[PDB]
Structure formats: structure tokens, C-alpha cells
Design a protein around this ligand. Structure first.
Ligand SMILES: Nc1ncnc2c1ncn2[C@@H]1O[C@H](COP(=O)(O)OP(=O)(O)NP(=O)(O)O)[C@@H](O)[C@H]1O
Ligand SMILES: Nc1ncnc2c1ncn2[C@@H]1O[C@H](COP(=O)(O)OP(=O)(O)NP(=O)(O)O)[C@@H](O)[C@H]1O
Ligand SMILES: Nc1ncnc2c1ncn2[C@@H]1O[C@H](COP(=O)(O)OP(=O)(O)NP(=O)(O)O)[C@@H](O)[C@H]1O
Lengths: 536, 639, 124, 138
DNA sequence: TTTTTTT
């Protein structure tokens, strides 16, 4: 719901005061409505009644009594003879607990800035306004140091924002805090103006003995320092000093490490419990990478879902083989340690390869899936200090597919054991240090003739699976042959590029993952398919 | 004088106990490199037993302490002891100590403050928590000692962490330092409140105006950058990065520093002066067999290795992976058909040791590829400061070279570079374990090579579905690799097991794995060395004692026959005619090998088969043709 | 400079023997190469063979059985393990090296070809 | 030619030693100082006797000395190459090294026989040693 | 640190 909106820190400021109010307003009608009326007089933008619902009980005084208070708020928002100021709310907060009121208000943004202004005679520096900016904007930005030793910014993206598609409810990477710079020359300028008005009020007080000359000196110095907010070097120094306040020590190493959370085009998909849920609100899970596909729950009545299921029935005629292949491809959405399995798909001519495997790759995106070259499997390995950037193309992804065969390639079994087992793999990123990571990828290879397995040990044959396509796609020359069917080029030209088709296929994959988690205990060896076993 | 006050807050008990007295004496010797504050501390603690006499004996004891204990105790230990014994008194004195320095600078420079002044004050009040040193690239690097209440990464407690920038020190300047700066302002106001006299308040007014002008520089970014740049010369310790992780008896762990200097191993979870930077994520708990994870792991260890003596040997061998010092030149080959839990053990040891202390080494470094040592070669930098290396790759029955097996096994010195690094030299300190699926073929018969090689055969299979009544085949577990090796509690239990076995090795024997008696291992190694002698097999197979035979066999004929025999029976490979001649010369052939009138080695009679069968019937051929009772972890200390 | 690592009976090029022994362009290193099997010298040049000296050791250090042959003795491994890393042993050996340098400078005029040793000449 | 005591000018006979201010741009040099030829110098007499010993016949000695004297000139010269052959301990490897040493690193260089014997390649490969005789006369 | 060029 975002009861304390990150774009408005005055909501948090007022929620602290509403917590500070006595608990006599809790579970009662009359004075609760009086404070609601006063708060709507001060600011009628659905914020303070939401803070009332958050801090205190929303409707414990009367269940279903929300609409009466909404109508009272509407009557307050319309022209109202009485107009209660916020000073009544400060008076009630001071009446309930003076020391707690004082302790609450020292941590506010305005009090920090005013304390700096009064204690340093209107001279404002980088750390002071960096501290105020962190106080009022600290939940939306974060800083961390990467492997190269540079401070990197991250911003949480909210629905109303000039946002790149699919970035909502996630942390996006920033080389510079673009939003913070504008905020300093805009939102911060507004609060600076409030401090100017406060100084003018204290100037309007009587002269007393000598305080009025000090007040005019303070006003002159603060008016001199107020222009520094729009200066480029000052803003750069403020942002440089703010990197030590916005710093979170273990943010980058935690950034994409939960394999049960998947960034999607409308939020974060959580597959921790069945059924999978869509987090499209504020949360504390660090999520940076995503896929462009939006998650809609699986519904077979969707025309795209129906078309895709009919296509799946077309590609694999055997029911058990179709169920096994769907269960295997559903595990591509998981980026954790999975079972040591590998599927080899063999097809003669125009078959379902490059439509199905490419569909899985396009619904998972570049961060979660990749296309790999067959030189990683067939050619002999390179000396490990050479920076193999193709081997780094499966670091944090749960899906990989090979697609090229020259003429009955012979695959290196050492690379097969290295890239399939649930262990650690060491490799060097280009122009970077040699490092070890974890194998979390579901791997599929499509061939045209065959693969030669030189060895006959139990190690390479307990992790190898084989399937041969029984359907030939020849539209023009489609005979009575049952395994022969007429093709549509749209499946390779338009349907694989269509976002609705991709959304439907992603829903199918999530449904099959949940089916595997429900019927079995997520273990794919228990999937009893005689066709795949006999072909192997 | 400040340190004299710190010594004055020390209790009289520090002269009651002799070792604590000597520790403080050595600490003061590291402070002053003389005996003047040492003599002041002698007079403060005890002016009355030895009195003036024995002062030369006190200098002798100072010289003896300065050449002892190998660990530099310095100011920070005394400051910590003063905090522990007199915390409130410790809070004061220092509170005014830097306040006075700052006051001296303010009064002697008329309130105009610069980078070096506040850098000196900041060093006076944070010198025990930060350090600066120059690395190999010529850059000044900061290190911060991590305290328990801190925004701290996991496992970093009670250690030195590397900081690109002293972020904490920057905040300290705009926060803690600003507070002491205020105290100065309150002091100036007191002087101004004091009567003007002649123009003293005029001075206070001028000094005040200048100080309030310069007080706002503490929050300026360029000023703080200049202060931090000036503090790099004050926080600098000249031998820090070189000494950073060099004690092999100290190991960084997730709850502090584990010390295996003295049995039993101790967890330092308080202040210390040991330089420790690297660590493992595993927290150390003392060994307890009643723990369910520990009991499960010990059951797996008993089930994997059925004989007790070999189980004790491999456990004593793998316990030495926690030591990063000089160990015996050893290499263990574990051979099995991929159906045993040998592979479960190596990944477990690597995971409880971490990436700083263990690494995975490909078999390419032993089989074919040569060491460059002129390119970057980041792969050979993966055993620089680690105590464990395991080979977990076998393509198809790899043949390992003798040169690499003599290069990286013996405790010598090796030289390599890395990215942005020069050709630096380091020491081999890693316990090495190689997994074999098919076979390892030792092409030599060298006495020095075979003294460092150990072999043990896997005897237990594991299968998923069928699980027959075979005594040597049991059922596998889906979790043992997928869940039980990711679990932190299982890793903690296994690390406790490793520390217990290291302590057992140090107790029953003098840390030498040669003195450990395992007759099974000796019998297997002798059998493997007999099976790896291809020359003996060739002589037994193709050379038969032909009585009254006039067949003339010069070494060249034997060399050619053996070369065909080796290439045909063993892997095809090139041979040295001369070296082969010497090899066949040193064998039973000597009995039937004699010089010729032309001085040429010849084999009298002894017709060679030259083919299958075709052997001489006459004169036959030439080639001669416990139990664990209750707990297995502990055993006979003196079998 | 020293060569120690012998895999299997290394043959050695006469070119590099000519290049890296001669005082060409600057070589200032005393060079020792050790082997366990053989060095294959493929030449018969007089200029190459005069810069080569050969010595064959006559002592084998036996640990376990220790027979009573005068040319084999009982050894301790500490000489490789502990005694080479001790700073006091290193100081003593450096003192020995300096003493023998002074002895060479005194008894001869710093020329090692003037040192008379029939064993080395006979073995070479 | 830059020399250790100034500039040697061989534009006219006799060669002159510029040891004062001049407008000739000269950066590289050799460490050898130039003294005029004097056969009564003991080192010069020793070297002339060594040259008489190494090459016995007079005409070949004069020819080889004339050919080696053109190493101090850094311009276009005749297309010639001398092949000096011998059995054993000869005067070779001392005379050629002497010419290289008196000319220095800028004005002379040592080339390996791999430049001549074999392994001419496609010029994608750099061959790593052909600019070792960029601007030197020997 | 790569390109290279190791070959
Ligand atoms: N279920 C389907 N129904 C109808 N047409 C299909 C179906 N699946 C694929 N096609 C078409 O079949 C054609 C073959 O393309 P493609 O799938 O790339 O062949 P391929 O076997 O994967 N690769 P290749 O064998 O080298 O040509 C494409 O034009 C697709 O549009
Ligand atoms: N002590 C044990 N008792 C029973 N099963 C075990 C034990 N240790 C390991 N296993 C099982 O045996 C297998 C060992 O893991 P694995 O990664 O296959 O190494 P591996 O035996 O060498 N197989 P491979 O790498 O192909 O040679 C897993 O399935 C474990 O569940
Ligand atoms: N003029 C000379 N008078 C006497 N000795 C000389 C003279 N010139 C050279 N030598 C010596 O003769 C030896 C020949 O060595 P060197 O100058 O290398 O000729 P070389 O042909 O290269 N010998 P080699 O390397 O076997 O082919 C050296 O010891 C020289 O010092």
C-alpha cells in the first residue's frame, strides 16, 4: 500500500507524530474523527488517515466503519467553516509526552537542518545537507562498493517514474544518483525556503537587547549559502559525501542470491510457496535483474495458452515424453542447485527445435538464460588463465541451450562432468580476476545427426538424456503421414516475438514447475517416462 | 606523559605476576625501543624490593623480553588493559589528551586550522583502529579493525578489513571530531566571560571569530579529503601487508580467530594484536560427538572407509589442511570407480576451509601443459596462500608428468606473477589430494618420487534404486550433495571434526604423518609401485631363460622390444634409447647381461618371445613369476 | 644460477651452452646444473668443452636399512626441512662462503683455473 | 657521430672533433672518446700487432680492415656481406665484438642467425627482430 | 588486461 510514500518524507514525519499521539484516540470514534478533520485541514491527500490506519487500529472501533470515516474526510476536504491547524496536533503531542515529543522531533529533517544552520551561523557545507538528504531520502537509494573498488548507486523504482520497461519494484543500477541531484535543486530548495521563513519570523520578534543584529547576520549568511544548492561542484561534493551515509555493506553480494525470487515485468514473482505470488508493492528483497515478461496466472482458456498447448501437443506426440520435457524445461526458472541432468534433442529436418528452446530462452531473458556455443562441449579445453568469456555466460542463469553441430561432433566428457554436476566451476572473466561460481543451469542441446560418447563409465551416463523428434514439419508437401504436419512460419517469425505468447508460455512454465513441486518432491528422476528411458 | 598516565592506571598485580610483568615490559620495549618509560614504569609499580639495585638486571630482562615471544605487543594492548581495569579513568585523560593538542594548535595558530592539525588529532583518537600500508602497486590501502557492534559483513569480526576509503574515519571527522571542536568553543566562551582586563577578551573575540570561521571546514568534502591524505603518513605501519597472513597457527573464522598454537585450540573473540585479514565463514565450536550433525558426519566417515587404520590415516592427512605452514612432501591418490564418497570429502574440506584457504586445481597442471611463468597465469596463483588443494577432474586415464609431480609436491619456492603483479615467489604449503576415476600411470621408478606418493583404493560402491545385499554397496542420498553440503551447521561440525583430528595428530605423534602406522596404506603403496613398474612386467612377459641359447641381445634389441611392449601394453609414448638402456641394464638382465669383446652390453641366451607364447620351457622364464569397538574417531595412542 | 629440475634425461643444445656461459652481452653468474640421470652433449667442440666441468657424487644417503658401506651413510631429513630455513644456519653458511672467497683470493690470484684438482680433471 | 668527448665529424679529411657549440642535432652517442690515430700508443701498437697475428696475408688484412672501417658510416653502402670461416680458436669473435663494443648500442647491434637460416613467415607474425638494425651501421 | 602471440 506504501502507507509512508518514499516520494514524500513528510508522510513519515507525520506518522511519527501520529504514533506520538496518546492511545486514547486508539479504538474510539469522536476525537479520532477530530484529529482526522484537523489533519485533512492541514493536508487532504489521503496520507494522514492512512497513517491513522497504519499506526493505530483501522476499524477495530467499528468493523466495516471505514466508509463513515471516508465520508467525514470528504466533508473535511470540502469547504469547512472550522479550520484546525497542525499546531493543535503538536499541542496534543506535547500534552501526552513532552520528552517523547522532543526526542521524536530531533530526528526530523527540518530539525537537523535548522540545528546546523543555527549552530554554524548559516554556513552550510557538504556533509550537513548530505545528512539531511539521507534523513529524508534514505529508503529509496543505496550505495555499495563493487569488485573494482568503485561506489555504485542503486535506486528503488516506484510506479510513477520515468522508468525503463520492466524495472518496477526493483533496484536499478546508477553510475550517478540522477534523481538525488534534481531532488537537491528542487525538494531540498523548498525546505531551505521554509528555514528562510523561520528566520524571518524570528527577525519579526522584538529587538530585545542585541539579538536582532545577530539575526540579520544569520539571514544574510543563509541567503548567501542558499544559492550553493544549484552549483555543480557543491552538488558533486554533497553526493560524494552522501556515499558514506547511504552505504550498505553487504548489498551487492546479496543482490541476486535468492533462487525463489524472479524479477518480472510487473514486479517480483515469488515461487517460495504454492501458489506462486506476485509482489507488486514495496518489499525488502534485493532484486536487480529481471525479465521483460509479465506474470499472469496459468489459465488454459486464454487463446494464446490454448495455441501454445496445442503446439506442444504437435511437437511431442508421446504424452509421457511431453510431460517429462515440460517438467525438465520448467526447472529453468529455478537458479539454485539442481540435479545433474542433460538433455540431447535430435531432429532430422524442420522440427520443434529453435522454437521451443528459443521460446524458453526468450521468456527467461538475457539475465536468466543464454545461448551457448558447441565449442564449450566438443573442443578441447583451453589453459585456465586465458579469460574464457564464453564460459562466463552461465554464471547466474538457470537455462542454457546449444544449437550447432558440424558433422556428428564428439563431445568432451570432462566438460560434460564439469558443466552438469552441482559443484563449483573456476573461470576467469575477461580483464578480471579468476573466480569460482556455482553451476545452476538446465542445459539442452539440439543436434542434426548425433553425438559420439567415447566413454562408457557410469559417471557420464547417469547425467545424459536423449530424445528424438518424431514429427516432420513440411507444410507444402504434407502427406497422409500422421507424424507429418503442415507448418506455419509464424511460429518462428511472429509468435516467438509476440509478448502475449511469451507471457502465456511463461505461465505454462510456472504451472509445470508447481506441478513438479506438488506431485513429486521437485525431483525429476521420479518422473516415470518409459519413452525417454528407452531412447537413452 | 600520556602513556605514563596510562601506565599509572595499571594495577599493582602487574608486578605480582612475572609473565604479565614481562609481557608489559616487552610491550613498552616495542613502544620506546629504549628503557626510559620502562624505568618510569619500574619506579611507578615497585620502587621497593630490588630498589636501585638490579637495574642492570632489569635492562637485561628488557633485552631478553625484546628478543622473545615472536609477536609484537604494542601500545594498543596497554590501552586495552587500561580500558578493562580502569574504563572510566580510561575514558578521561584521553578525552582531554587530544583536546589539549587541538587547543595548542588553536591557540598557537590563532584559530586557523589546516589538514595536518586535525589529522594529528584524529590519529591521536583513532590510531588503534585504523592502519595504512603500501601494497605492490604502490597505493596506500586502509585497514579497519572490526568490533562487535558495527555494520559488519558476515565473518569479519575481530579482524582487519580492507577499505577503499576510510568511510568510518570520514564520518568520525564530521561527528566525533566536531564534538571535541565544540568543547573548544565552550572553552573560548569561558575566557571571554572572564574579565576583559586590558585586551585579553579582544584576543578571545578575534580568536573566536577565526575559530568559528574555520569550524565549518570539518564538513567540507575537499578539506576532509586533504585530511585523510595527510593522515596516511601518520597511520602508516611499515610491515603490515607483508605480515598480514603469515602465522600458520592462526585462522580467521566466522566468530573470531582460531589459534592452534597450543592444544586445546582457543577461540580469540576479544581484542588482540595478531594481523588477520582472511577468514572462513565457518564458526568454530569445540568438538562434540553428541551433536546430531557431528554424529551423522562420523557415521558417513565410518561407512566410507571400512578399515580403521586407513580411516585414521586419511583423517590425519585431511586435518593438516587447516595448517598453512611447512608440511611433509606428500601426495595422496584415491582411486575409485566414481561410486564412493571420496568426492564428497574433498568438496566438504574445501567448503569448510573457504576460497582463501582452499582451491580446486585442474589436472591439466599435472598431465600435459607446461608452466609458463612469464605470462600473467592467474590459475597458478590459486594456491598462493592456501593449505588445501584437490584435483577433481579426470577425462580418460590421464598420465601425469614426473616433473610437475616433483615441482609442486616438495616444499620449495615457486615463482609466478598475476594481473598488475611482478614475478613474485612464494612457498608451497598445500595438502594435496587427487581423485582418480580410471587410473594414474607413473612413468618413472625414481626413489625420491615414490617416497612422496601414497595410494589407497576405494572399496565401497553406492547405488540409487536397486541396493542389493552386497556388503560393499549401500544406498545414496539426494540431500548429501544438494542440501547437506550447503548447510552451515554441517560445515561447522565437519570443521570441528578436522580440528579434533589435527589435535589428535599433534598429541599421539609429533605432528609427523610418517610416524603414523597404517599397514594397509604401506601395502597398497608397495602394490601400486610394483604394478607401475612396466620394465619388470616386460622382462617377466617377453624374456624367458633359454638354456644353452646362443641368442645375442645387445641393449638396443632389449630397448626396441621394451619400447614396443610399453607402447603396445602401456600408453604409446616416446622413449630415450640411452635412458632405456640404463633402465633395462639396472634389472635381473644384469645376471644374463655381459660385455662383448668389442665392449658392448649383450644378453647371453635368454631368447626373447618376440610374440605371444613362444616361451622357452627350459629353465622357465627370467622374470620371477583392526575393528572399531565403540567409537572409531579415537584409537590406540601407542598401538 | 642453478638448474635442478630433471624430468627424464635431458638433452641440451650446444647453442645455449655457448650463449649463456661466455662473457658476452652482462653475465656475472656462477652456474651449477644438477641431474639424476644424464646430460646429452651432442658436440665435440674444444671451445665448448673447456667451459664445462663435471663431478659425479659417490655418497648415497640411506635412511631405513643403513648398511655398513663406507660410501653410504645414515641421513636425517632435517637438512632439507629445518636446517635450510634456519636463519642461524644461513648466517653460518654465508660466513663459510666469505671465508672460502678470501681463501681463493689469497692462495691463488682469484683464478679458479689455477686451482689444481686431479679428480675434477679426470672426471671431466 | 656522437662520442664521449663531443662530436666526431668525418665530412672532410682529416676527421675533426667538435668540442664547442654547434647547431648539429645529435642525441645518440657512444661512450668511446676520440683520440687521433697514433701508432706509438702502446694500446694501438698492441692492437696492430694483434691484427697482424690474426690475418697473416697483407692484402686480405687490408681488405678486412677497410670493410670493417665502413661500420662507422651510417649511410647507404655497397651490397656486401662477409662470411668469416674457421676451424677453432681463431681471431674471430674478438675482432667483431671489438667493433660492436667501440660502436656501442646505438651504432651497432648483435643479430641472431635465425634471421638468416630459416623461418621466413607470413607477415601477420611480427618476427620480433628486424628493427634491431634500424639506424645503426654495424 | 586485453589485443596479442604463444604456435
Ligand atoms: N508446432 C508447430 N506448428 C506448425 N509449424 C511449426 C511448429 N513448430 C515449428 N513450426 C515451423 O517449423 C519451421 C521449422 O523451423 P525450425 O523450428 O527453426 O526448424 P528446426 O528444425 O528447429 N532447425 P533446422 O532443422 O536446422 O531447420 C518454422 O518455420 C516454424 O514456423
Ligand atoms: N557416506 C555416504 N553414504 C551414502 N551415500 C553417500 C555417502 N557419501 C555420499 N553419498 C552419495 O553418493 C553420491 C556422492 O556424490 P557425487 O557428487 O556423485 O560424487 P561421486 O560419488 O564421485 N559421483 P561422480 O562425481 O560422478 O564420480 C551422492 O549421491 C551422495 O548422496
Ligand atoms: N692476436 C691475438 N693474439 C693472441 N691471442 C689471441 C689473439 N686474438 C685472440 N686471441 C685469443 O685466442 C682465443 C680465440 O678465441 P676467440 O676470440 O673467441 O676466437 P674463436 O674463433 O671464436 N674461438 P671459438 O669460439 O672456439 O670459435 C681467445 O682466448 C683470445 O683471447
Amino acid at each position: 500500500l506504501s502507507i509512508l510514500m518514499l516520494h514524500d518524507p513528510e508522510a513519515r514525519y507525520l506518522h511519527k507524530i501520529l504514533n506520538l499521539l496518546p492511545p486514547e484516540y486508539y479504538v474510539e470514534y469522536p476525537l479520532w474523527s477530530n484529529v482526522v478533520f484537523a489533519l485533512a485541514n492541514t493536508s487532504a491527500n489521503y496520507r494522514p488517515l492512512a497513517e491513522w490506519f497504519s499506526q493505530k487500529c483501522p476499524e477495530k472501533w467499528n468493523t466495516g466503519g471505514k466508509e463513515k470515516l471516508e465520508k467525514l474526510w470528504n466533508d473535511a476536504s470540502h469547504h469547512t467553516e472550522k479550520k484546525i491547524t497542525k499546531r493543535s496536533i503538536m499541542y496534543w503531542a506535547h500534552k501526552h509526552a513532552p520528552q517523547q515529543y522532543k526526542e521524536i522531533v530531533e530526528q526530523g529533517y527540518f530539525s537537523i537542518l535548522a540545528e546546523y544552520v543555527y549552530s554554524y551561523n548559516g554556513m552550510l557545507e557538504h556533509y550537513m545537507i548530505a545528512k539531511v538528504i539521507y534523513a529524508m531520502m534514505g529508503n529509496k537509494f543505496v550505495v555499495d562498493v563493487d569488485s573494482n573498488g568503485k561506489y555504485v548507486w542503486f535506486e528503488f523504482v516506484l510506479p510513477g517514474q520515468p522508468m525503463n520497461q520492466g524495472e518496477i519494484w526493483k533496484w536499478r543500477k546508477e553510475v550517478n544518483p540522477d534523481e538525488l541531484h534534481i531532488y537537491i535543486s528542487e525538494n531540498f530548495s523548498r525546505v531551505m525556503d521554509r528555514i528562510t521563513e523561520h528566520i524571518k519570523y524570528h527577525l519579526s520578534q522584538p529587538h530585545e537587547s542585541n539579538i536582532l543584529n545577530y539575526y540579520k547576520k544569520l539571514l544574510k549568511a543563509f541567503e548567501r549559502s542558499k544559492s550553493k544548492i544549484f552549483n555543480d561542484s557543491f552538488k558533486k561534493g554533497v553526493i560524494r559525501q552522501a556515499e558514506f551515509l547511504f552505504r550498505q555493506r553487504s548489498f551487492i553480494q546479496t543482490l541476486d542470491t535468492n533462487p525463489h525470487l524472479l524479477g518480472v515485468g510487473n514486479g517480483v514473482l515469488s515461487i517460495e510457496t504454492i501458489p506462486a505470488k506476485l509482489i507488486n508493492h514495496f518489499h525488502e528483497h534485493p532484486i536487480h535483474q529481471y525479465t521483460h515478461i509479465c506474470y499472469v496466472p496459468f489459465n488454459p482458456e486464454n487463446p494464446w495458452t490454448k495455441l501454445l498447448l496445442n503446439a506442444l501437443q504437435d511437437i511431442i506426440p508421446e504424452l509421457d515424453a511431453r510431460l517429462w520435457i515440460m517438467f525438465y524445461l520448467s526447472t529453468a526458472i529455478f537458479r539454485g542447485l539442481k540435479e545433474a541432468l542433460m538433455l540431447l534433442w535430435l531432429g532430422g529436418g524442420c522440427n520443434g527445435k529453435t522454437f521451443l528452446m528459443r521460446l524458453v530462452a526468450m521468456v527467461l531473458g538475457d539475465h536468466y538464460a543464454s545461448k551457448l556455443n558447441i565449442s564449450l562441449l566438443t573442443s578441447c579445453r583451453e589453459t585456465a588463465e586465458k579469460p574464457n568469456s564464453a564460459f562466463m555466460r552461465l554464471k547466474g542463469r538457470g537455462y542454457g541451450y546449444f544449437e550447432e553441430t558440424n558433422k556428428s561432433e564428439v563431445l568432451n566428457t570432462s566438460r560434460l562432468k564439469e558443466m552438469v554436476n552441482p559443484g563449483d566451476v573456476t573461470a576467469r572473466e575477461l580483464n578480471q580476476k579468476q573466480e569460482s561460481f556455482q553451476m545452476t543451469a538446465t542445459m539442452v542441446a539440439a543436434s542434426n545427426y548425433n553425438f559420439i560418447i567415447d566413454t562408457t563409465d557410469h559417471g557420464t551416463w547417469r547425467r545424459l538424456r536423449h530424445y528424438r523428434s518424431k514429427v516432420k514439419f513440411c507444410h507444402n508437401p504434407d502427406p497422409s503421414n500422421p507424424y507429418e504436419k503442415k507448418e506455419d512460419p509464424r511460429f518462428i517469425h511472429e509468435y516467438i516475438m509476440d509478448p502475449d505468447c511469451q507471457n502465456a508460455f511463461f505461465s505454462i512454465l510456472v504451472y509445470f514447475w508447481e506441478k513438479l513441486q506438488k506431485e513429486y518432491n521437485g525431483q525429476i528422476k521420479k518422473v516415470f517416462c518409459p519413452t525417454i528411458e528407452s531412447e537413452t | 606523559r600520556y602513556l605514563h598516565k596510562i601506565l599509572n592506571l595499571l594495577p599493582p598485580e602487574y608486578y605480582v605476576e612475572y609473565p604479565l610483568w614481562s609481557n608489559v615490559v616487552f610491550a613498552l620495549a616495542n613502544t620506546s625501543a629504549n628503557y626510559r618509560p620502562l624505568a618510569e614504569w619500574f619506579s611507578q609499580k615497585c620502587p621497593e624490593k630490588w630498589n636501585t639495585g638490579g637495574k642492570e638486571k632489569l635492562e637485561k630482562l628488557w633485552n631478553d623480553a625484546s628478543h622473545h615471544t615472536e609477536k609484537k605487543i604494542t601500545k594498543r594492548s596497554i590501552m586495552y588493559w587500561a580500558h578493562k581495569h580502569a574504563p572510566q579513568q580510561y575514558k578521561e585523560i584521553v578525552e582531554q589528551g587530544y583536546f589539549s593538542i587541538l587547543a595548542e594548535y588553536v591557540y598557537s595558530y590563532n584559530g586557523m586550522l589546516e589538514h595536518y592539525m586535525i589529522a594529528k588529532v584524529i590519529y591521536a583518537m583513532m590510531g588503534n583502529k585504523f592502519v595504512v600500508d603500501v601494497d605492490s602497486n604502490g597505493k596506500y590501502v586502509w585497514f579497519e579493525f572490526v568490533l562487535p557492534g558495527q555494520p559488519m559483513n558476515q565473518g569479519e569480526i575481530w579482524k582487519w578489513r580492507k577499505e577503499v576509503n576510510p568511510d568510518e574515519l570520514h564520518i568520525y571527522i564530521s561527528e566525533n571530531f566536531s564534538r571535541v571542536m565544540d568543547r573548544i568553543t565552550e572553552h573560548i566562551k569561558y575566557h571571554l566571560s572572564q574579565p576583559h582586563e586590558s585586551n585579553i577578551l579582544n584576543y578571545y573575540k578575534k580568536l573566536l571569530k577565526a575559530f568559528e570561521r574555520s569550524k565549518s571546514k570539518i564538513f567540507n568534502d575537499s578539506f576532509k579529503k586533504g585530511v585523510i591524505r595527510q593522515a596516511e603518513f601518520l597511520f602508516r605501519q611499515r610491515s603490515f601487508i607483508q605480515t598480514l597472513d603469515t602465522n600458520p597457527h592462526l585462522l580467521g573464522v566466522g566468530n573470531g580467530v582460531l589459534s592452534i598454537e597450543t592444544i586445546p585450540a582457543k577461540l580469540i573473540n576479544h581484542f588482540h594484536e595478531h594481523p588477520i585479514h582472511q577468514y572462513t565463514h565457518i564458526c568454530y565450536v569445540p568438538f562434540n560427538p553428541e551433536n546430531p550433525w557431528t554424529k551423522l558426519l562420523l557415521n558417513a566417515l565410518q561407512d566410507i572407509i571400512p578399515e580403521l587404520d586407513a580411516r585414521l590415516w586419511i583423517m590425519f592427512y585431511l586435518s593438516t589442511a587447516i595448517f598453512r605452514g611447512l608440511k611433509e612432501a606428500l601426495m595422496l591418490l584415491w582411486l575409485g570407480g566414481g561410486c564412493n564418497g571420496k568426492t564428497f570429502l574433498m568438496r566438504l574440506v574445501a567448503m569448510v576451509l573457504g576460497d582463501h584457504y582452499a582451491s580446486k586445481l585442474n589436472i591439466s597442471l599435472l598431465t600435459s601443459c607446461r608452466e609458463t611463468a612469464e605470462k600473467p597465469n592467474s590459475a597458478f596463483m590459486r594456491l598462493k596462500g592456501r593449505g588445501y588443494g584437490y584435483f577433481e577432474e579426470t577425462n580418460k586415464s590421464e598420465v601425469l608428468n614426473t616433473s610437475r609431480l616433483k615441482e609442486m609436491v616438495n616444499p620449495g619456492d615457486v615463482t609466478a606473477r598475476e594481473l598488475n603483479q611482478k614475478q613474485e615467489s612464494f612457498q608451497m604449503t598445500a595438502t594435496m589430494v587427487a581423485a582418480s576415476n580410471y587410473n594414474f600411470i607413473i612413468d618413472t621408478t625414481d626413489h625420491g618420487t615414490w617416497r612422496r606418493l601414497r595410494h589407497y583404493r576405494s572399496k565401497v560402491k553406492f547405488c540409487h534404486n536397486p541396493d542389493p545385499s552386497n556388503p560393499y554397496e549401500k544406498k545414496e542420498d539426494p540431500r548429501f550433495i544438494h542440501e547437506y553440503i550447503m548447510d552451515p551447521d554441517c560445515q561447522n561440525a565437519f570443521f570441528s571434526i578436522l580440528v579434533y583430528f589435527w589435535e589428535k595428530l599433534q598429541k599421539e605423534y609429533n605432528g609427523q604423518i610418517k610416524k603414523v602406522f597404517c599397514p594397509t596404506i604401506e601395502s597398497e603403496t608397495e602394490a601400486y609401485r610394483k604394478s607401475q613398474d612396466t620394465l619388470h612386467r616386460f622382462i617377466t612377459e617377453r624374456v624367458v631363460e633359454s638354456p644353452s641359447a646362443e641368442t645375442v641381445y645387445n641393449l638396443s634389441e632389449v630397448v626396441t622390444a621394451y619400447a614396443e611392449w610399453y607402447n603396445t601394453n602401456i600408453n604409446v609414448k616416446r622413449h630415450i634409447a640411452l635412458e632405456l638402456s640404463q633402465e633395462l641394464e639396472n634389472s635381473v638382465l644384469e645376471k644374463y647381461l655381459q660385455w662383448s669383446p668389442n665392449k658392448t652390453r649383450i644378453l647371453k641366451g635368454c631368447r626373447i618371445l618376440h610374440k605371444f607364447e613362444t616361451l622357452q620351457p627350459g629353465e622357465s622364464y627370467i622374470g620371477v613369476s583392526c575393528e572399531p569397538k565403540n567409537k572409531w574417531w579415537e584409537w590406540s595412542p601407542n598401538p
